[PDB]
Amino acid sequence: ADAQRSHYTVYPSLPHIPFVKLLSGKESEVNVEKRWELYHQLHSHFHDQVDHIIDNIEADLKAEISDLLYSRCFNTIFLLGSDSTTKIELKDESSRYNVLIELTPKESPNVRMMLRRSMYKLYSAADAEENDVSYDLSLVENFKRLFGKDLAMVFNFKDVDSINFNTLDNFIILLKSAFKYDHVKISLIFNINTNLSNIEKNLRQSTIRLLKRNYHKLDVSSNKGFKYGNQIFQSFLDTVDGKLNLSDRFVEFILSKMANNTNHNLQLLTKMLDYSLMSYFFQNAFSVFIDPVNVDFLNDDYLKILSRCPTFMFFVEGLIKQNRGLEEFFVEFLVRENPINGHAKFVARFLEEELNITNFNLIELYHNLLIGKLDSYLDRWSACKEYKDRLHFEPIDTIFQELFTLDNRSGLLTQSIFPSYKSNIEDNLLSWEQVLPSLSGDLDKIMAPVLGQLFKLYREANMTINIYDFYIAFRETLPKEEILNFIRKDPSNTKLLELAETPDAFDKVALILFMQAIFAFENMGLIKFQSTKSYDLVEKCVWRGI
Amino acid sequence: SASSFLDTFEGYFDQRKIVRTNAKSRHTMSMAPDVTREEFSLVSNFFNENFQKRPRQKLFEIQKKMFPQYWFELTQGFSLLFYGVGSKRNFLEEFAIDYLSPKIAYSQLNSIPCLILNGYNPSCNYRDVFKEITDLLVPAELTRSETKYWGNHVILQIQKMIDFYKNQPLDIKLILVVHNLDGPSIRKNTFQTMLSFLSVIRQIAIVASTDHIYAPLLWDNMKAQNYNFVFHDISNFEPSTVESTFQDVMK
Amino acid sequence: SRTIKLWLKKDVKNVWENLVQLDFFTEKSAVGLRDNATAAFYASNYQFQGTMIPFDLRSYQMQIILQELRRIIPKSNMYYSWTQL
DNA sequence: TTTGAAAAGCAAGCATAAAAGATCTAAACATAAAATCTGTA
DNA sequence: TACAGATTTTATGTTTAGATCTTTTATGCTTGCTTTTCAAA
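YS: structure for the whole thing
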């Protein structure tokens, strides 16, 4: 059986886009096709820019590392906030050989393995450029005799906050012995993810005094100075400029989620931007009108949906206070620029170039421009006081702009990318009628699913539960006569009828249904058995809403 | 419980009170009825195949209308992680075999092969899983320089696969259906590192399921970035007949 | 109260490491040097719990007790009165 | 405003779970000389 | 047939992942005793 194997491969027998028909299934398939094609143009125009930005990130990181690296002690570099995913390349300079030795905490169980791996890497690189050796530090001693060149080792310690600091301290003290060989120079790179002070107290004071003789700090987080996330957000602004607009709720959600992630919030930002674009091009039937070629394909369904617009609602209510024409109005009034993105780019390049204000985030600037508080964002620097009237902007609440918007009100972004996983499990357990429809019809209405009843009795019990008392409490809610009527409603199965004929049938059925749910609860992680060979009491591990 | 709160940290602190020794009951299973294995199995399958089968079938017909959205999420590089109350075994097989592999195979013109891991099995082993992955995908063998010094050959091979498949066209070649990504042998760190690094590759589709309430504790920022999950609650109150036989039930 | 510079806790760490290196304190229940190379190799592939906690919580034991300290510290020393309890 | 009394907290004792690690083995990873296969000349 | 070269067999060394068992220390239940705030007079 395939259900009992560890793994198996299936080559299933077979006998064109994932977009479905909107407009209650009265949309045409050609509009589905151009929805797909418009989504792909927007996605490609975003991700080409994102790829260029990422390549620029690694390029300037390599340049800054090499500048700090080449311009009787170690040359120590602390890369603060580093995920250790940077490819360090050394120069090719004659009469000296430069080796990069990368060491991970998995590759560092003790000092002996650290030295053996480093010396194998040293000998492998030096043999690969231009007789066996012992993989210890004497190869560093005899390097000029065996290869005719001076030696520059750069040690890149990947993920320093995971390494054993006693082993690392002993390895650095061991590497100190190479200082007397006159042809060797050693650089150390520590990829720190917490703080320098944490790795200060985990090392010996003499090791700190050794490292202090020549050291530099280089801070490269994912949003060091916000400069790289601003580029990604601006490329997303340019790919939807004049085409889609951002609500303040969506930008607020973006800022809230980037505040909750430290090292990898650039990819998280790209992830929610692409998921919002996916949700729009999967949801909105009006996205074909993103392209101004498709405006002649209007229908009565389109005009019926677009009439329920609150901005158009207020516009026609103001008109009455003060179809063909509606069609011409809808054609004419979607042309304009919506200049919030151009003004945001102008304010960004004015603050970055002229005033030399560089520690700003474009996302909160765009949020304040969306809510009309750009002065209330700008007055935190006390340098653009003379230009507050210069950079003043107020948004124009254009009509049917919510038919082309990226907005977070349904919680689809919350449910898909950052769900309340444990709370959703507990809510589905406690309130199962929001899961199972309300359509053996007598039993399905009078008795709950066993997992939900077990969770209802679980929630209102103590920290320690006696499972016999728990099983009696579960048994008192079940109906006896309806269960016995349901178990006898299968006349083909005679063992069921024979067990239903016994006077202790309901206790056995209740115990079977109780034990299946108890093992389900144990597998899910809700309950914990106390002892291995007692199995008489349980502890609750899980409380709802915490 | 003789308590004032049930939910939140208030309920956590209020329900963990020091119960006295005299208040504790002494009831055991000795006053419980004795059942055999066969009547347990008989009542089990009868209740699984007749209690609320019609609402479960209606709800399963409701969740099948989300299959094009799942396919659309898989074409953009997201990995599907399905969670909920009840078994998701039949759902994952039916979506990944009856729907996803023929749609992907027709969309890029045999069907796409589907490798199914059973993480509810304690004997699910990452080396044999990578052996079948190597058999299906035929990657280039590591050179002597790439083997490092007693390095893990599986992880180094997958890193070679990652910087090989970055240049290939974005065509899905393998579907990886992981049942119970939180099961006893798959939840270990080496297996999770292996599967997140396989989730990096655009040309592999990842469909996974979890059962534990604490399953997002398995993934840090590196693993959540590499996995790139879209989460979907598909709670159905399915009985989990297949996964229950890998534990000793009657004890 | 009856003037010595009171050294801060960040400076006493160097003194503490010097005292550990000079075999005045030993880590609690530490085996030390193994009898043979096989046990030493087995110990070199295991990470001890003392080396993964911060240094200010590591448990130590004395190689010289307070009574010995009272025996060999001179009477003219101004910390002599605290070797008594 | 009191009452008092049942819940909460303290503490000695003791069985028991569990942390730490000593000792060891399987398995992945790695090398190598002699024998044996293998495709040609 | 002979033979150079490639692969297999036999044989051993290196390193990591994990199991088992012991010893010492945390911890959870028992039981008796003291303090304390909360639902009625």
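YS: worth flagging: The longest strand of chain A covers residues 184-192.
IM: good catch. Also Residues 531 of chain A lie near DNA strand D (CB under 10 Å from a C1').
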